[PDB]
Amino acid sequence: LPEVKVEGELGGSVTIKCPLPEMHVRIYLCREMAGSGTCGTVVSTTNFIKAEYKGRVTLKQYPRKNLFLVEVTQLTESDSGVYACGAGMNTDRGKTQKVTLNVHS
Amino acid sequence: LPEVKVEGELGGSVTIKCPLPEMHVRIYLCREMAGSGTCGTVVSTTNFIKAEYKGRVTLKQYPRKNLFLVEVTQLTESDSGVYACGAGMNTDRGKTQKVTLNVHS
Amino acid sequence: ILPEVKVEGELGGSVTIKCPLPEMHVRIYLCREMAGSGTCGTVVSTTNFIKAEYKGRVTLKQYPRKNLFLVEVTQLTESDSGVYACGAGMNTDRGKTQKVTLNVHS
Amino acid sequence: REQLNLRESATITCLVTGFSPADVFVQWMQRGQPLSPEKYVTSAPMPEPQAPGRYFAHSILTVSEEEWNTGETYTCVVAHEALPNRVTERTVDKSTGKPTLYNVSLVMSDTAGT
Amino acid sequence: LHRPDVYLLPPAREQLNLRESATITCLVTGFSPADVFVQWMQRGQPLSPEKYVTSAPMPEPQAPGRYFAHSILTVSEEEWNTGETYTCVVAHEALPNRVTERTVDKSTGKPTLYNVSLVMSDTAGTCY
Amino acid sequence: REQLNLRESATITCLVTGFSPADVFVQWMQRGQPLSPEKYVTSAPMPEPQAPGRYFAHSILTVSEEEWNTGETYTCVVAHEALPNRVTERTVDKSTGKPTLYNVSLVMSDTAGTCY
Amino acid sequence: ERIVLVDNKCKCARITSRIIRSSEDPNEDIVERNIRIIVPLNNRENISDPTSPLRTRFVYHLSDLCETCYTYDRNKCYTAVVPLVYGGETKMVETALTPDACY
Numbered sequence: 160l161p162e163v164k165v166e167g168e169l170g171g172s173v174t175i176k177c178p179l180p181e182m183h184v185r186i187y188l189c190r191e192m193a194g195s196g197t198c199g200t201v202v203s204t205t206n207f208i209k210a211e212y213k214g215r216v217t218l219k220q221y222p223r224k225n226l227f228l229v230e231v232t233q234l235t236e237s238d239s240g241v242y243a244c245g246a247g248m249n250t251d252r253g254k255t256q257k258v259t260l261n262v263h264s
Numbered sequence: 265l266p267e268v269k270v271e272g273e274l275g276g277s278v279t280i281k282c283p284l285p286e287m288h289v290r291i292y293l294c295r296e297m298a299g300s301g302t303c304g305t306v307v308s309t310t311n312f313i314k315a316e317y318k319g320r321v322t323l324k325q326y327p328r329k330n331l332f333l334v335e336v337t338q339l340t341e342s343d344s345g346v347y348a349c350g351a352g353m354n355t356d357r358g359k360t361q362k363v364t365l366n367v368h369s
Numbered sequence: 370i371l372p373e374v375k376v377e378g379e380l381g382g383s384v385t386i387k388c389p390l391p392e393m394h395v396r397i398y399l400c401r402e403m404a405g406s407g408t409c410g411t412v413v414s415t416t417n418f419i420k421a422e423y424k425g426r427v428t429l430k431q432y433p434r435k436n437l438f439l440v441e442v443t444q445l446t447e448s449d450s451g452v453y454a455c456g457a458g459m460n461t462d463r464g465k466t467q468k469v470t471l472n473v474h475s
Numbered sequence: 476r477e478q479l480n481l482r483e484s485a486t487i488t489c490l491v492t493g494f495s496p497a498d499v500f501v502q503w504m505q506r507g508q509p510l511s512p513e514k515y516v517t518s519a520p521m522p523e524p525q526a527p528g529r530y531f532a533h534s535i536l537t538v539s540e541e542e543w544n545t546g547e548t549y550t551c552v553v554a555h556e557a558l559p560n561r562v563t564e565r566t567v568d569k570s571t572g573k574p575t576l577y578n579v580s581l582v583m584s585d586t587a588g589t
Numbered sequence: 590l591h592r593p594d595v596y597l598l599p600p601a602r603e604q605l606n607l608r609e610s611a612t613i614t615c616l617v618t619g620f621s622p623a624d625v626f627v628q629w630m631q632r633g634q635p636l637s638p639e640k641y642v643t644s645a646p647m648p649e650p651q652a653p654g655r656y657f658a659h660s661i662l663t664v665s666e667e668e669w670n671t672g673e674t675y676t677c678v679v680a681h682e683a684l685p686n687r688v689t690e691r692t693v694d695k696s697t698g699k700p701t702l703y704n705v706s707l708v709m710s711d712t713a714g715t716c717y
Numbered sequence: 718r719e720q721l722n723l724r725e726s727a728t729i730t731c732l733v734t735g736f737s738p739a740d741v742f743v744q745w746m747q748r749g750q751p752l753s754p755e756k757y758v759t760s761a762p763m764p765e766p767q768a769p770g771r772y773f774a775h776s777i778l779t780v781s782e783e784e785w786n787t788g789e790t791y792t793c794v795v796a797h798e799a800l801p802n803r804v805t806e807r808t809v810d811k812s813t814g815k816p817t818l819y820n821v822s823l824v825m826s827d828t829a830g831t832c833y
Numbered sequence: 834e835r836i837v838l839v840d841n842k843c844k845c846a847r848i849t850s851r852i853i854r855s856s857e858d859p860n861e862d863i864v865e866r867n868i869r870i871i872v873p874l875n876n877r878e879n880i881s882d883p884t885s886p887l888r889t890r891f892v893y894h895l896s897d898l899c900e901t902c903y904t905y906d907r908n909k910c911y912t913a914v915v916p917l918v919y920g921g922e923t924k925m926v927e928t929a930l931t932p933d934a935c936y
């Protein structure tokens with residue numbers, strides 16, 4: 160529901176801030192493909208980093224402020240869309256928070 | 265049928281004016297989700313305050329001018345849609361009056 | 370649904386038909402509905418009408434006291450057989466109130 | 476459904492029935508973890524007016540209709556010390572019933588029909 | 590102080606597969622202050638108290654002042670071919686008519702098919 | 718239909734039928750506004766061959782094609798002793814007079830619902 | 834056999850139900866539900882005012898059935914008022930919109 164819509168620059172890295180809920184073990188940062196109404200998991204606690212994002216992203220969870228932070232290293236035009244983050248086995252029925260990304264170059 | 269088109273500001277509080285009918289005990293201020301044609305009760309006389317609105321809303325009824333007033337404290341972007349108010353056990357059959365809300369910030 | 374009263378003739382010569390009389394309606398018919406299409410063709414009705422074939426052998430007598438109306442048909446032939454209906458209103462089909470059958474053992 | 480249309484809360488019951496001796500530990504779990512027991516309530520064993528040696532139980536879980544309609548199985552578990560593995564569980568959802576077919580028979584001919 | 594809401598449920602689908610008996614549950618919630626009892630009548634004839642087992646008023650999970658109670662009843666499986674509707678009832682002081690007879694039957698419940706037969710005509714104005 | 722093909726002017730008729738005795742007052746108005754008596758012509762009661770002791774009458778109104786093609790609505794009120802309210806009326810327009818298409822938007826919802 | 838849940842005459846909806854016996858067993862007794870709406874394509878929007886445009890959209894909230902109206906009632910009379918200028922005397926007079934049912 161809230162939109163951090165965190166921005167950034169080409170290259171470097173950008174940190175995505177998403178809420179870390181309780182009583183939900185699987186935490187993911189799905190990418191809203193918005194093609195045929197389907198969202199593809201970019202990263203998860205079950206250990207699945209999409210091939211296009213392999214070796215460039217990480218997910219660290221620490222229940223200090225009830226927040227989990229995901230960092231995206233490097234940047235490409237492709238990295239300029241919506242990455243709804245959420246929890247639960249069903250990826251399309253979570254998406255607790257919505258965010259937007261772009262490129263400044 | 266009637267629309268208050270009530271307006272307010274971010275923060276503070278805003279009062280929603282809706283008609284208080286007779287021969288109808290359950291009085292609610294449903295929120296028109298307008299997703300799959302379903303409206304979710306925000307508050308009711310049966311005592312049900314949605315979790316997202318817990319501790320921020322109240323409903324006071326007084327048949328002086330045949331009016332019941334509902335106050336929403338605080339404000340968020342989420343609080344900027346349609347809140348049809350009505351009566352009767354069925355919720356998606358009442359919606360006697362329709363109203364709209366927004367944010368000025 | 371409404372009753373399915375049935376009558377017979379026991380050889381020709383005369384026949385008598387009775388149907389309930391509704392209230393607050395001015396039209397009364399006895400269409401035969403003996404058509405392949407099914408569309409009922411009014412045989413004898415009030416509001417002034419009669420059947421090209423059925424003439425001089427058909428009459429109607431409405432009795433509000435008994436909540437009944439009476440129709441008397443003289444003689445008998447092969448054509449005037451099958452089934453018959455009764456009703457009111459201004460729509461011969463969709464306005465029926467009985468389904469009577471006419472037969473002769475001759 | 477007489478409560479669903481009201482859109483207030485969906486109450487699911489788990490009718491544990493027939494356990495002897497009177498000892499049972501019902502728990503409600505979803506998403507792979509037991510839901511905080513506080514959200515649900517259960518009742519103590521009670522006799523029957525039939526057969527010598529039986530006990531029954533109850534449980535109620537309250538969840539907003541929307542969440543129930545969106546998804547969520549909310550399985551129920553029964554912990555009695557006579558089960559083959561000491562644990563037995565059942566599950567329900569919206570589509571737990573026989574599939575319903577539609578025999579739509581649209582007719583556009585004014586002649587046909589009433 | 591609110592109207593005591595009441596509901597009734599039919600026997601489970603998988604319950605009708607052992608051919609021993611069946612249970613019907615009448616759920617009574619609300620009734621603040623807690624003043625209710627249920628009598629299960631059928632055809633206007635009250636049933637034996639040994640059949641239905643009401644237990645107690647219990648506070649709702651979140652209870653400002655509300656409460657709730659549950660009452661079931663045991664029947665025979667082979668008697669459901671006719672239904673008999675096994676009516677339930679509740680009583681409370683916060684009710685204008687102090688009775689809310691609630692009853693269900695095999696016929697009432699989930700429809701397993703929907704035979705819609707809509708028709709179009711230019712002579713339906715009167716809707717005889 | 719053939720008359721409208723010419724796209725010149727359209728004539729609407731009103732056939733009263735089978736009233737005894739002969740005392741029918743007829744008039745025409747357009748969208749709630751009465752028209753001049755000189756814009757239409759009314760016949761006189763004449764015998765009915767099929768029905769002994771029965772009479773019938775006609776009435777025609779003429780207007781331009783544009784007016785008929787602007788959804789304007791016309792009605793034919795009549796007055797007779799037999800009429801229970803002493804006055805009855807019928808009404809037609811472009812969409813109701815032998816239309817070419819049947820635009821329909823059938824829509825139903827909650828078919829399952831809770832029915833008792 | 835069939836019980837009647839809805840007999841609305843304004844919407845001509847006849848909601849009914851019936852349970853059919855299975856093949857000599859008390860199991861899988863499938864239930865039924867028959868719905869029969871009869872749409873009028875000649876009626877107006879305001880049924881009691883013969884000037885409103887024709888009725889195109891038909892919305893059926895089955896929950897309410899089991900106020901805008903669609904069809905007439907065979908057991909009722911509909912009336913209105915029209916200006917009669919007879920004798921240069923514009924006069925509003927009652928008119929039996931649905932005659933033969935006002936007797």
Ligand SMILES: *[C@@H]1O[C@H](CO)[C@@H](O[C@@H]2O[C@H](CO)[C@@H](O)[C@H](O)[C@H]2NC(C)=O)[C@H](O)[C@H]1NC(C)=O
Binds near residue numbers: 879881882
């Ligand atoms: C449908 O038509 C009726 C009849 O004209 C409208 O109700 C009438 O409104 C007038 C004043 O405008 C009153 O003089 C009448 O008494 C009313 N009729 C009745 C029966 O009370 C009605 O408002 C129209 N509906 C719409 C949506 O326009």
Ligand SMILES: *[C@@H]1O[C@H](CO)[C@@H](O)[C@H](O)[C@H]1NC(C)=O
Binds near residue numbers: 578580702
């Ligand atoms: C489908 O509809 C037809 C026509 O009413 C009926 O004969 C048939 O039995 C129906 N099928 C089912 C499975 O209900």
Ligand SMILES: *[C@@H]1O[C@H](CO)[C@@H](O)[C@H](O)[C@H]1NC(C)=O
Binds near residue numbers: 578580704706867
């Ligand atoms: C389906 O509807 C049609 C039309 O009313 C009816 O003739 C038929 O018997 C129905 N089928 C069933 C199985 O009820």
Ligand SMILES: *[C@@H]1O[C@H](CO)[C@@H](O)[C@H](O)[C@H]1NC(C)=O
Binds near residue numbers: 820822
């Ligand atoms: C036919 O219906 C559609 C909506 O279904 C509407 O857009 C269109 O205007 C209608 N046609 C006419 C001539 O009004």
